[PDB]
Amino acid sequence: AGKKRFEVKKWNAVALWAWDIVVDNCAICRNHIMDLCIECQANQASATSEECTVAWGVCNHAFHFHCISRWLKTRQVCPLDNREWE
Amino acid sequence: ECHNIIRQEKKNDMANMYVLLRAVSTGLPHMIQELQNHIHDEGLRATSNLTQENMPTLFVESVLEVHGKFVQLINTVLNGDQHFMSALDKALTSVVNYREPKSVCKAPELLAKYCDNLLKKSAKGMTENEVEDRLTSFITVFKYIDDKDVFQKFYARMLAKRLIHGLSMSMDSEEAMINKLKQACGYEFTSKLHRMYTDMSVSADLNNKFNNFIKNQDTVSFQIYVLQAGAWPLTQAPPQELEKSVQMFELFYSQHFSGRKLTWLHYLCTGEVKMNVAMVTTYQMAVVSYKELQDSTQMNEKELTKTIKSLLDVKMINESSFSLNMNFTPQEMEQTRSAVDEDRKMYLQAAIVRIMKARKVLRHNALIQEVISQSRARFNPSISMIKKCIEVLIDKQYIERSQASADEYSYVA
Ligand SMILES: [Zn+2]
Ligand SMILES: [Zn+2]
């Protein structure tokens, strides 16, 4: 035995988690996906801030449902990618 | 004689003055006003007595000393009453957010540090089973904070570090603190702190499932804390594991939650003591100069160099030769002001949207004292910050302008 072992032992891992975006204040709304959008924040809505209405596209990236609906009602592109919306 | 008498503690003149001033309509408001001035004088004196010392425990004790003296005085010689109590609360609210000639307000930092000193397992200036009474008393100053936003963020960072590294005294005591802060400042406003607290407990319970998962099959156990990113201030500090099968944890968490993204904060993980403080708890490189341990597998070299320096200079490695040992935040808060700025811009965007829905056209002269009413629950912003909101929302397609001869801000939807 020696003092240089650095043996495999009990360990405490740490991780972040989020809804599926490279978020960086996602462009439809200057808020986290884990927080209310601007409309719901201004109204101080009763919805769960952590999951307000999360939805996912066919590309499996996530969006705020309200924001993507409003965007869809004016333009035909995916908001995060500018490809065809699906 | 009201001014002379309210500033005197002794004898019958106070007593019968309060009786005769209960009688007169103009009497009790003058007593209330003079007592409010007296309280502001005494509180400012008590707080300003601590120049260059700035100890958080003594700061809170100075405020509570003034509060206790005036509560005792009011009950002893005036009466227990809402108006005198309100004068005390208003005056100390005006007092606590400092206005010194050469330094911006440091009270929310000292109050966050007071809470952390209460909750720390070291318990140097405070002790468990007295911390309950201390944090009950802390509510008095908590209601008095103007920038509750700044106090909340500053406490949140040290909460995160304390709970992740296990420095907090009692998990139950941390919950008790967060509940008291919630009822003092708002459950919705303190919800993110509550979520941050909840992550360790829920992940600790989820590790009961992860241990079963690890024992279910071999070739792909350890504790995990998985953290809700929108609330947490900590990052990966853009790191070898003690147990080192973390992708099993990733697979477990993803399969348990099919709808959640995740990434690993290797910089914050910790192991277990002793070989056969006894400190081997961090960054088990397993291997020589400290810099040569940058020969790891594929990993972010920024974190690698940070951990190498940390490993080199704590306890374990006892340039020409090396060997192992034989046996055994003000700048950060000032940095956190940046995140405060981002959060305040978001918050003011929401508040301005509410104001614009309330009235669809306005000017900045009317917006003054309306934004303060709509933001003082959290913070007391500056006019430059309010304009920073408005003069960007004009180009966000939130606000529009057409008038030439006067001011304008018209709602867009
Ligand atoms: Zn967004
Ligand atoms: Zn896409």
Curated annotation (Swiss-Prot), chain A:
Catalytic activity: S-ubiquitinyl-[E2 ubiquitin-conjugating enzyme]-L-cysteine + [acceptor protein]-L-lysine = [E2 ubiquitin-conjugating enzyme]-L-cysteine + N(6)-ubiquitinyl-[acceptor protein]-L-lysine; S-[NEDD8-protein]-yl-[E2 NEDD8-conjugating enzyme]-L-cysteine + [cullin]-L-lysine = [E2 NEDD8-conjugating enzyme]-L-cysteine + N(6)-[NEDD8-protein]-yl-[cullin]-L-lysine
Zinc finger extent (RING-type): 37-82
Domain of life where this protein originates: Eukaryota
Biological process terms in GO annotation: cellular response to amino acid stimulus; cellular response to chemical stress; cellular response to oxidative stress; cellular response to UV; DNA damage response; MAPK cascade; negative regulation of canonical Wnt signaling pathway; negative regulation of insulin receptor signaling pathway
One of the record's GO molecular function terms: ubiquitin protein ligase activity
Protein's UniProt keywords contain Manganese: no
EC number: 2.3.2.27, 2.3.2.32
Amino acids binding Zn(2+) 3: C59, H61, C78, D81
Disulfide bonds listed in the record: none
Known tissue expression: Widely expressed.
Residues annotated for Zn(2+) 2 binding in this entry: C37, C40, C52, H66
Binding-site list for Zn(2+) 1: C26, C29, H64, C67
Keywords in alphabetical order: Acetylation, Cytoplasm, DNA damage, DNA repair, Host-virus interaction, Metal-binding, Nucleus, Phosphoprotein, Transferase, Ubl conjugation pathway, Zinc, Zinc-finger
Pathway assigned in UniProt: Protein modification; protein ubiquitination; Protein modification; protein neddylation
Places the protein is found: Cytoplasm; Nucleus
Signal peptide: none
GO terms under cellular component: Cul2-RING ubiquitin ligase complex; Cul3-RING ubiquitin ligase complex; Cul4-RING E3 ubiquitin ligase complex; Cul4A-RING E3 ubiquitin ligase complex; Cul4B-RING E3 ubiquitin ligase complex; Cul5-RING ubiquitin ligase complex; Cul7-RING ubiquitin ligase complex; cullin-RING ubiquitin ligase complex
Record's subunit section: Component of multiple Cul1-RING E3 ubiquitin-protein ligase complexes commonly known as SCF (SKP1-CUL1-F-box) complexes, consisting of CUL1, SKP1, RBX1 and a variable F-box domain-containing protein. Part of a SCF(SKP2) complex consisting of CUL1, RBX1, SKP1 and SKP2. Part of a SCF(FBXO3) complex consisting of CUL1, FBXO3, RBX1 and SKP1; this complex interacts with PML via FBXO3. Component of the SCF(Cyclin F) complex consisting of CUL1, RBX1, SKP1 and CCNF. Identified in a SCF E3 ubiquitin ligase complex together with HINT1 and CDC34.
Family: Belongs to the RING-box family.
Task performed by this protein: E3 ubiquitin ligase component of multiple cullin-RING-based E3 ubiquitin-protein ligase (CRLs) complexes which mediate the ubiquitination and subsequent proteasomal degradation of target proteins, including proteins involved in cell cycle progression, signal transduction, transcription and transcription-coupled nucleotide excision repair. CRLs complexes and ARIH1 collaborate in tandem to mediate ubiquitination of target proteins, ARIH1 mediating addition of the first ubiquitin on CRLs targets.
Designated name of the protein: E3 ubiquitin-protein ligase RBX1
Originating organism: Homo sapiens (Human)
Gene behind this protein: RBX1
UniProtKB/Swiss-Prot annotation, chain B:
Pathway(s) served: Protein modification; protein ubiquitination
Cross-link (Glycyl lysine isopeptide (Lys-Gly) (interchain with G-Cter in NEDD8)): K357
Biological process terms in GO annotation: G1/S transition of mitotic cell cycle; intrinsic apoptotic signaling pathway; protein ubiquitination; SCF-dependent proteasomal ubiquitin-dependent protein catabolic process; ubiquitin-dependent protein catabolic process via the C-end degron rule pathway
GO molecular function terms noted in the UniProt entry: protein-macromolecule adaptor activity; ubiquitin ligase complex scaffold activity; ubiquitin protein ligase binding; ubiquitin-protein transferase activity
Record's comment on post-translational modification: Neddylated; which enhances the ubiquitination activity of ECS (Elongin BC-CUL2/5-SOCS-box protein) E3 ubiquitin-protein ligase complexes. Neddylation leads to structural rearrangment in the complex that allows interaction between the E2 ubiquitin-conjugating enzyme and the acceptor ubiquitin. CBC(VHL) complex formation seems to promote neddylation. Deneddylated via its interaction with the COP9 signalosome (CSN) complex.
Cellular localisation: Nucleus
Effect of D343K: Activates UBE2R2-mediated ubiquitin chain extension in the absence of neddylation
Residue span(s) of domain Cullin neddylation: 343-403
Main subcellular location: nucleus
Cellular component aspect of the GO annotation: Cul2-RING ubiquitin ligase complex; cytosol; nucleolus; nucleoplasm; SCF ubiquitin ligase complex
Keyword terms, alphabetized: Acetylation, Host-virus interaction, Isopeptide bond, Nucleus, Phosphoprotein, Ubl conjugation, Ubl conjugation pathway
Domain of life where this protein originates: Eukaryota
This protein's record includes keyword Endoplasmic reticulum: no
Record-listed N6-acetyllysine modification sites: K113
Modification sites for Phosphothreonine: T329
Complex and partners: Component of multiple Cul2-RING (CRL2) E3 ubiquitin-protein ligase complexes consisting of CUL2, Elongin BC (ELOB and ELOC), RBX1 and a variable substrate-specific adapter; this complex is also known as ECS (Elongin BC-CUL2/5-SOCS-box protein) complex and may consist of CUL2 or CUL5. Component of a ECS(VHL) or CBC(VHL) complex containing CUL2, RBX1, ELOB, ELOC and VHL. Component of the ECS(MED8) complex with the probable substrate recognition component MED8. (Microbial infection) Interacts with human respiratory syncytial virus (HRSV) protein NS1.
Function: Core component of multiple cullin-RING-based ECS (ElonginB/C-CUL2/5-SOCS-box protein) E3 ubiquitin-protein ligase complexes, which mediate the ubiquitination of target proteins. CUL2 serves as a rigid scaffold in the complex and may contribute to catalysis through positioning of the substrate and the E2 ubiquitin-conjugating enzyme. The E3 ubiquitin-protein ligase activity of the complex is dependent on the neddylation of the cullin subunit and is inhibited by the association of the deneddylated cullin subunit with TIP120A/CAND1.
Sequence similarity: Belongs to the cullin family.
Protein name per its UniProtKB record: Cullin-2
Organism this protein belongs to: Homo sapiens (Human)
Source organism phylogeny: Eukaryota, Metazoa, Chordata, Craniata, Vertebrata
